[PDB]
Write a protein that binds this ligand. Structure first.
Ligand code: HEC
Ligand code: HEC
Ligand code: HEC
Ligand code: HEC
Ligand SMILES: Nc1cccc(C(F)(F)F)c1
Ligand SMILES: Nc1cccc(C(F)(F)F)c1
Lengths: 294, 108, 294, 108
């Protein structure tokens, strides 16, 4: 019966103004709850959540993806690779009750877009229309990438998401955000000093820091710098691969180009698997709180 | 003053988690991502010895006191457009009050 | 020689969006500093402030009024009638720093408008264009009304502000907000249960509560109820006077009508003494924080 | 639970300042502007005998728990349109946790 089809259906009677208010609510809670994770804030974990709900997508049969909003169900919830994302879900649940008309998928992806922008990242155009689907459509565990791999694994994995070399290197710049937590992933440490502000630091630290391969307290191995930063084995593989390396150099030298490419790739990621109608509205570019004087 | 003396202990926890990764405070402490902050109060912006500033931090030329420091920390790139200090900002007044109080003592 | 005319002059290049951001900054600080005065908040003192800087007006020679922003000068600032308003001025002080272009008069009146709207009161149309005038234009003390008086005094006093019976009874409904503080005025206590939400409770409590005239701890005589509420002698005189009584009963039965009349009289109060040019902008209706998704 | 936990001592001061003028908590406590709140958790809305509710509160028919309490106290008129509870709302999460923590033990 071929890959199934997911048709974006705009929440009945809603437009830009409605979603901007959801944006604002998320954005205001981001500013208010500044203590979380030793004052890193909820920004990075909301970006990770958007990626994890989207990263389940399989282009071959159109299963997974952000459309169905299936992370709200137990099976995807207790996915061991989603360890720690419960915090992001609990962050968004009171806002869901505030705007119960919004689909789970639209909410999860919007949280990602809001976090990136509010952390002074690039503008990310966002489209509505994701629709909640039954529990039996929930993707099985094991669809997300393993961090203890090399460049070839990363390149092949992301083909399943229809991403090419430039898209993957751009997306991975988001690993300047937040940190790995030993209790969640078996990895520990931040990747730089600027943990909750969106910059091209990932690429700069990748090239300019002195990295050493070490065992952490979970006996997993990671690249550590004397300044106290870490890189996952998959992240470091970006400078082991010649094609990835040239793109890494590119973003290190030009944050503007990085911002533009990340915006495109992140939107594509959040929209993978979704069929947008001809009469579908143009994507929204939300204003930040700063722009609104809020 | 418009600025109020808050909790230095709370300001210390604020500094440890949001500043220390880029700044040291004690006398003669090393420059890291950002300049050492000893004797920052009563000193013009861009005067730390050995650090490489942006020409936006220098041309601002502001005499740091507890008042304009509160404005700077609320929103760095709004007070000084072009600074390479990537920091979200202390948006809560009490947090600013607490941190400055700690910073006053620590940077003496 | 020749009558004093105060012509509204718009702050250079400023428009609605500029003042909406001043509104928002006031409204956010309202919600942030919510512990003030045992969690009453800054709402009530901000509307009292707008009233006190406006209530200096004399219709006969156009002295006083909100135009000049002369409350920033010592003589008016230390008026015994303004005791306790320092808190409201301190509140707006950081706001004025953020928006140095706005006149003192526009800031004080906008404070009152913002507080009323954010306390779920009616929308109050507001106009900009007040201009700071020199210290020598500062009104002498004694122009504000005394609380230990009767209905005749109230009526006569408000004649000086060009206010009729319906206007004064409406304006007086603001005494639902906040409380009297012994250290400030020599009176103590709230007028009712809902202290920082704008309602018609002042009128209902005036005729549904059983009031007794007592001496407080400053030896001033005030009307007390068994519920623990108080009224000033001037407040109670609104149900002693037959013409005032009929209007009090009207508002006690129709909050919508009270809201409409208050909105008119309060804007008139804030604009007394100001000449608006024919090409001046139409009055602004600011959106509340809630209307912006917050 | 979705409701974490807060300070019961802080919750108590919130209740006395922002709730007590309309609500009593102890057993047999009198109805005032608002209904007595003893046994509010584990009770459907608008079911305290002796108090006259709005139709809205009664028709809402929600079983009060720590979570829908938090939603209601954030913005009473939004959660129950037509309610006559005139309240600004607890716009801070911590305040909501603190008060609900106190309210749970107090209305035992
Ligand atoms: C890196 C991620 C930083 C964080 C977090 C904080 N600061 Fe910062 N700061 C940083 C840089 C790179 C610079 C130099 C800016 C330039 O354009 O050259 C600064 C600057 C300051 C200053 C001004 C110093 C001077 O003018 O001599 C101050 C007073 C300062 N920083 C303080 C400060 C505080 C209190 C912080 C946390 C609450 C903080 N900074 C965060 C880098 C980074
Ligand atoms: C008067 C000014 C009040 C204040 C302040 C608070 N409440 Fe209230 N409450 C009030 C009324 C008039 C009503 C009935 C509303 C209606 O539509 O009938 C209520 C109702 C409640 C309820 C629901 C009771 C029930 O369903 O049986 C709760 C749980 C409640 N109020 C709690 C509450 C809290 C915790 C407050 C302060 C933080 C608070 N109220 C303020 C009157 C007033
Ligand atoms: C576009 C966004 C994005 C992409 C793509 C992405 N991540 Fe990350 N991931 C994040 C963010 C942001 C964090 C930090 C979250 C935090 O601090 O809570 C994170 C954290 C992690 C962590 C640690 C989580 C913890 O709490 O310990 C692991 C492990 C991880 N990612 C693996 C991967 C791997 C492997 C890939 C690809 C091969 C990948 N991620 C791709 C955004 C992304
Ligand atoms: C439109 C608004 C308005 C008008 C008109 C008004 N008031 Fe009130 N006044 C207030 C508000 C609101 C407060 C509460 C301030 C607070 O809670 O800090 C207040 C407070 C007071 C206080 C006590 C101040 C203190 O802190 O103890 C006195 C006394 C007072 N007003 C006298 C009067 C008298 C007398 C009149 C008229 C005869 C009058 N006011 C008219 C709004 C008004
Ligand atoms: N997953 C993650 C999160 C933050 C930083 C990093 C590092 F910089 F180490 F790559 C990885
Ligand atoms: N004087 C005065 C002022 C404001 C409020 C009240 C009260 F609410 F107490 F009636 C009285």
């Amino acid at each position: 019966t071929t890959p199934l089809v997911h048709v974006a259906s705009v929440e009945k009677g809603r437009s830009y103004e409605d979603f901007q208010k959801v944006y604002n609510a998320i954005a205001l809670k981001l500013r208010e709850d500044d203590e979380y994770d030793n004052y890193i804030g909820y920004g990075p974990v909301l970006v990770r959540l958007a990626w994890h709900i989207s990263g389940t997508w399989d282009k071959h049969d159109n299963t997974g993806g952000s459309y169905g909003g299936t992370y709200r169900f137990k099976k995807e919830f207790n996915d061991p690779s989603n360890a720690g994302l419960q915090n992001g879900f609990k962050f968004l649940e009171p806002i869901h009750k505030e705007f119960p008309w919004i689909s789970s998928g639209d909410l999860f992806s919007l949280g990602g877009v809001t976090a990136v922008q509010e952390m002074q990242g690039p503008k990310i155009p966002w489209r509505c229309g994701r629709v909640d689907t039954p529990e039996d459509t929930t993707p099985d565990n094991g669809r997300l990438p393993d961090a203890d791999k090399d460049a070839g694994y990363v390149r092949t994995f992301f083909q399943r998401l229809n991403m090419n070399d430039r898209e993957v290197v751009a997306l991975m710049g988001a690993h300047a955000l937040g940190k790995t937590h030993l209790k969640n992933s078996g990895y520990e440490g931040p990747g730089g000093a600027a943990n909750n502000v969106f910059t091209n630091e990932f690429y700069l630290n990748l090239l300019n820091e002195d990295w050493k391969l070490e065992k952490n307290d979970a006996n997993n191995e990671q690249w550590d710098s004397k300044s106290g930063y870490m890189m996952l084995p998959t992240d470091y593989s970006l400078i082991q691969d010649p094609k990835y390396l040239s793109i890494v150099k590119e973003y290190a030298n030009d944050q503007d180009k990085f911002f533009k490419d990340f915006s495109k790739a992140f939107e594509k990621l959040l929209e993978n698997g979704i069929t947008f109608p001809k009469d579908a509205p143009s994507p929204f570019i939300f204003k930040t709180l700063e722009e609104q004087g809020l | 003053t418009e600025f109020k003396a808050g909790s230095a202990k709370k300001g210390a926890t604020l500094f440890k988690t949001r500043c220390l990764q880029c700044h040291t405070v004690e006398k003669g402490g090393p420059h890291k991502v950002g300049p050492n902050l000893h004797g920052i109060f009563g000193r013009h912006s861009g005067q730390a010895e050995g650090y490489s500033y942006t020409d936006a931090n220098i041309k601002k030329n502001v005499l740091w006191d507890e008042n304009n420091m509160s404005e700077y920390l609320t929103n760095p790139k709004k007070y000084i457009p072009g600074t390479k200090m990537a920091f979200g900002g202390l948006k809560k007044e009490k947090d600013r009050n607490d941190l400055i109080t700690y910073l006053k003592k620590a940077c003496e």
